[PDB]
């Protein structure tokens, strides 16, 4: 009831009692562990008040005014509005608290040491896709800050009935296009090949190349989504060069500075925000390892090995490993030489251990998903490999949600 | 009740029903996942027959003689012996089946594609530590096979009362010594520093160097353990050289060929074999990544980076990553040039996916621990990173057990 997690590199032990507050289910049972399953899995007025109460109790118990008169009135105020409207609206302060704690509770995120430095943009007055585009453009501009990246989230109106949903259809605000070829292979990013074709379906004019920034597909109040192009001056890009290999420029790779997830659902006090694009800065491995070297992504281990003069005949020459380190030295070096914020997986994972210690002390725990926290290269030379982690589901939270083109009732 | 695991690199799906046969508990609950906890946690005659029955049912249902007369007599035969003796003895065939399936069920093992090619040595007639040494020496000789390594296990008498236990006190049959210094630092292997001092306590004469093979500490029928030196001609060693860097020989590293775990417990039909040393061959990363580059092991990233001419000032130069690839190219290259069996993490993890497909088809599943299957470097460029895995506990099994010096009643 007071579980211990050990670090086996430092012998440091920490005690978790935060997991007691946990509410949702993980997927695992007493007899099966599902910690390597990727995506394991309308609202009525009865369900809503315990969720509002639970949330309001921790918000006021965090501004040191637990259960006071100011609390109990807000508790009464929300109850009455859930009676009247069968839903309710968050105060601006409650929205900012909820958002920051959805990120704080995100067990799959290695960057949460920054969770309280989050800029919250309140777009709950938005009504059209054009307003969404406008809000999103101001988000991109603000978070990018000329390469001195700043963390941010923009929150569109909450789900009401279910058939009037705000959705950003892109999985990220800035992604490169993916075109399959007549000869079967793929130009650009294979991940987005279906999304690239949805944009052409609704009317996009593709400049069929490699790193073509996709347009936004924005759905407002359930209406069919509409295409908008981010002004290119707002899409900051880093050309990737190596600090040794001058042929590396000829590879002709580049990446966008701003990681901005737009397909997830923010849950606050039982309210569901179906469009809540949120952005930080990249850990280098996300680009250099997964984006560039995943077999079903850009898949560049082939060509980088070639130009490095590598023994590619044998599996056990580790040519794949060797070209992979060089690629991530190049991503890092390019971002820093351009004053574009980026963190290496050693600095990020050390910061997360430091974050874990802060959380266990002044919070009694830190939900953490080892499968996702450990970086996708050099796992055991980073301190998170050696750190036991309890995973559990706290609210407020970011949740996955179906792709909107499978669920929308089109017209 | 018929769960699906997906591979996200190939989109291949497999259905698990083997997990239904699972019996033991994992540590996880509906509300907490413990898949990154390292070690999560006398026998009476009532408990013993269901365990014997369960085991005998699957043994006969595997030689295509489920529930026949030959089965039901053995079922009756064991019941009567559990009445008579409050325990029982396995047939030689049952011992070999049980052992091979303990390995087959070992969810943390990436090498299980070889599980049916296991050589079982029956040491249940052993009575003294000298007999144990003799059995163990024949095990080392057989499994090493002049570098053409062969998988093997030696099974000493089963636990009876609890105070008459056979134990190998070494955690592995062949390990290097670890000496702390007066100036605090460590020569040899820091993992074994306490065990190195237990040997000196019982009378070992340490040649205080680096790669000093430790002696065996063998406990027989609960008696205090005794020291024995493996004849050095039976300890095959690989000197580690690089196929580019001739200064790499000057590093003066070497490793033993034979990975042989000796501190675990083999459970078969509810019988407990407290001494069951088992050996295979190395995956290169176990040496080059964990043994050599763990901070609290040999910790050689420091010196390899130096001689490579590396930017060691900054964290984000990835000097640690770069020296790590070279070290594992050297481990691999040395073992193969000496005709000593070794597998690279690309070949081993591809073989394990292939193994998983075989298991899901002709067995309905494969218990697998992602946290341990994914190699400790280059995780996502190997196919196991992208493969969902269900972890569950099947029997027969290898289980962890306390170190014998914490539990023994000495005299
Ligand atoms: C500030 C810099 C940040 C860094 C360095 C960082 C790092 C990461 C990384 C490496 C992942 C794994 C993503 C993947 O492998 O696909 C991740 C996941 C995640 N991050 Fe963070 N992150 C940052 C900011 C944020 C912010 C500002 C939020 C929310 C407001 C956030 C919420 C999440 C969530 C919900 C996930 C899970 C995504 C999923 O499950 O698909 N992160 N983060
Ligand atoms: C044949 C070549 C083999 C290879 C390449 C191999 C590979 C591995 C690796 C890399 C690990 C993780 C160990 C670690 O990181 O400390 C492991 C664990 C394990 N292996 Fe295998 N193995 C082999 C043979 C065997 C055999 C013959 C058995 C049993 C008869 C076995 C049973 C186990 C067990 C029980 C574990 C878990 C150890 C623990 O939890 O501490 N392995 N194996
Ligand atoms: C099968 C496995 O769950 C899947 O590949 C996960 C593994 N861990 C991950 N970790 C991170 N950070 N990102 C990912 O996409 C994944 N993918
Ligand atoms: C904290 C974590 O459970 C621990 O470091 C594990 C991680 N995965 C591992 N995987 C393997 N193969 N071997 C290990 O020793 C470990 N250690
Ligand atoms: C805010 C943020 C920062 C960062 N550094 N990284 C991410 C994750 C990028 C997208 N990930 C693919 C997925 F959908 F699984 C989530 C998000
Ligand atoms: C048979 C075998 C083969 C192999 N290739 N590797 C191992 C594991 C070596 C020891 N491991 C450290 C631990 F105790 F955790 C288990 C065992
Ligand atoms: Zn679990």
Curated annotation (Swiss-Prot), chains A, B:
The chain holds residues 299 to 717 of 1429 of the full protein. Changing residue 282 to H: 50% decrease of nitric-oxide synthase activity. Ubiquitinated; mediated by STUB1/CHIP in the presence of Hsp70 and Hsp40 (in vitro). L-arginine binds at residues 172, 281-282, 286. Homodimer. Interacts with DLG4 (via N-terminal tandem pair of PDZ domains); the interaction possibly being prevented by the association between NOS1 and CAPON. Forms a ternary complex with CAPON and RASD1. Forms a ternary complex with CAPON and SYN1. Interacts with ZDHHC23. Interacts with NOSIP; which may impair its synaptic location. Interacts with HTR4. Interacts with SLC6A4. Interacts with VAC14. The PDZ domain participates in protein-protein interaction, and is responsible for targeting nNos to synaptic membranes. Mediates interaction with VAC14. (6R)-L-erythro-5,6,7,8-tetrahydrobiopterin binds at residues 36, 371-372, 385. Isoform N-NOS-1 is expressed in brain and colorectum. Found in the Auerbach's plexus of the enteric nervous system. Isoform PNNOS is expressed in the penis, urethra, prostate, and skeletal muscle, and coexists with the cerebellar nnos in the pelvic plexus, bladder and liver, and is detectable in the cerebellum. This is Nitric oxide synthase 1. It comes from Rattus norvegicus (Rat).
């Amino acid at each position: 009831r007071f579980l211990k997690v050990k670090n086996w590199e430092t012998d440091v032990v920490l005690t978790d009692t935060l997991h007691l507050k946990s509410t949702l289910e993980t997927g695992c049972t007493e007899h099966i562990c599902m910690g390597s399953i990727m995506l394991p899995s309308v609202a009525t007025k009865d369900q809503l008040f315990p969720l509002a109460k639970e949330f309001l109790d921790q918000y006021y118990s965090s501004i040191k005014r637990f259960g006071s008169k100011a609390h109990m009135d807000r508790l009464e105020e929300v109850n009455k509005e859930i009676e009247s409207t069968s839903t309710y609206q968050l105060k601006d302060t409650e929205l900012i608290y909820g958002a920051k704690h959805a990120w704080r509770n995100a067990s799959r995120c290695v960057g949460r040491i920054q969770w309280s430095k989050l800029q919250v943009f309140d777009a709950r007055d938005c009504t059209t896709a054009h307003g969404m585009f406008n809000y999103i453009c101001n988000h991109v501009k603000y978070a990018t800050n000329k390469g001195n990246l700043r963390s941010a989230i923009t929150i569109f109106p909450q789900r009401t009935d279910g058939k009037h949903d705000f959705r950003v259809w892109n999985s990220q605000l800035i992604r490169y296009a993916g075109y399959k070829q007549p000869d079967g292979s793929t130009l650009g990013d294979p991940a987005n090949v279906q999304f690239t074709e949805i944009c052409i379906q609704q009317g996009w004019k593709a400049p069929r190349g490699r790193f073509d920034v996709l347009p936004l597909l924005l759905q407002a109040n359930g209406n069919d989504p509409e295409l908008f192009q981010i002004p290119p001056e707002l899409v900051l890009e880093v050309p990737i060069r190596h600090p040794k290999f001058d042929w590396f420029k000829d590879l002709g790779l580049k990446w966008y500075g701003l990681p901005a997830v737009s397909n997830m659902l923010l849950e606050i006090g039982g309210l569901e925000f179906s469009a809540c694009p949120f952005s930080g800065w990249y850990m280098g491995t996300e680009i250099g390892v997964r984006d560039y070297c995943d077999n079903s992504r850009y898949n560049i281990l082939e060509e980088v090995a070639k130009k490095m003069d590598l023994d590619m005949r044998k599996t056990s020459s580790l040519w794949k490993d060797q070209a992979l380190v060089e690629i991530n030295i190049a991503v890092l070096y390019s971002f820093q030489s351009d004053k574009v914020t980026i963190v290496d997986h050693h600095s990020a994972t050390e910061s997360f251990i430091k974050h874990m210690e802060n959380e266990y002390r002044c919070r009694g725990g830190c939900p953490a998903d080892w499968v996702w926290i450990v970086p996708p290269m050099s796992g055991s030379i980073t301190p998170v490999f050696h750190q036991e982690m309890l995973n559990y589901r706290l609210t407020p939270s970011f949740e996955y949600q179906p792709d909107p083109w499978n669920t929308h009732v089109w017209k």
